């Protein structure tokens, strides 16, 4: 048994079995990947995403909790639950607040190849992701779906190179440890790179990324990560087609 | 003014005296730079002029003249 309720669902499910109540929430329903379920719902017009598993909600919940400890901007979780006589085959749920207004970074950079952004805005975004991912990894969380589309740029204010905030989302497969093994670090870095092959990153936008990501001199990175970087460049070539 | 800014950056970047920063000097053999320094130089240029240099252009910046030509 694991259960954490926060507002508004703490009162909403007071004398209620919350595992029943999540199944009773309503709204635009989505993915039904074998027992799993995602749906958007509103409480006083707020908007929350409901993920029910009947792999479970634990992955997202511990990533979200570690990222909050580490100061990495992400979803806020207002409800979470696990129960089951078989600790392997648990019934779980997690409800996260909606982040809005936002535009994810793939959409935002959709057509940088042809509509080039301000250079300083570009480099600030490249670096802001380098910081978050680095921060994520140093805090013991590897994403497993580390793509630019899972980073939200916040549009509640005008966006400039000097003022913008990101949030990382979709942690449904995220693994949380006290230290992120290097193989898992590299998978995220690989995936983040392949998601970004089509936005006009110069060779130097990528070195900028690596420096900020590792927080080590560029010369050391290119030496000690040589094989990783050569592999990523080789995969990225074939993926370009 | 711009024609001088480029000369100043190459010097602050490559750690060479302003007198050695001649339009004929290639960074690699004349100003003691290696590979990466040129790239860090190209980056420093991008950042000082708040611009972006495409990888095709930046690989043609191998001399001081090459550097000034691009900014103008
Ligand atoms: P000399 O010392 O002989 O050689 C010089 C040099 C440049 C070091 C050498 O030739 C070399 O090693 N490579 C040549 C070209 C180059 O610049 N390579 C380095 C960059 S490519 C790389 O390192 C492999 C993968 C890139 C790293 C990942 C990028 C992450 C990007 C994701 C950002 C997300 C944000 C997007 C905004 C919406």
Task: Describe, in short, the structure shown.
Chain B: Residues 1-72 form the Carrier domain. With 241 residues, chain A is an alpha+beta fold.
- State the helix count of chain B: 4
Structural class of chain B: mainly alpha
- Strand order, sheet with most strands of chain A: 1-4-5-3-2
Largest interface: A-B, 13 and 14 residues
* Separation, N- and C-terminal Cα atoms of chain B: 11 Å
According to DSSP, the number of beta strands of chain B is 0
Biggest beta-sheet profile of chain B? none
Give the class of chain A from helix and strand content and strand pairing: alpha+beta
Bound molecules: the ligand *P(=O)(O)OCC(C)(C)[C@H](O)C(=O)NCCC(=O)NCCSC(=O)CCCCCCCCCCCCCCC
Strand elements of chain A, count: 10
Strand content of chain B: under 5%
Number of H/I helices of chain A: 9
Q: Tell me the domain tally of chain B.
A: 1
Distance between the termini of chain A: 49 Å
Largest sheet of chain A: 5 strands, antiparallel
How helix-rich are the residues of chain B, as a percent range?
A: 40-55%
Q: How much helical structure, as a percent, in the residues of chain A? A: 25-40%
What Rg of chain A, in angstroms, do the CA atoms define?
Answer: 19 Å
Instruction: Spell the H/E element sequence of chain A.
Output: EHHEEHEEEHHEEEEHHHH
Structural shape of chain A: globular
InterPro entries (chain A): Kinase-like_dom_sf, Lsacc_core_hep_kinase_RfaP
EC number (chain A): 2.7.1.235, 2.7.10.2
Modified residues (Phosphotyrosine) (chain A): 30, 48, 80, 147, 193, 213, 240
Pfam families (chain A): Kdo
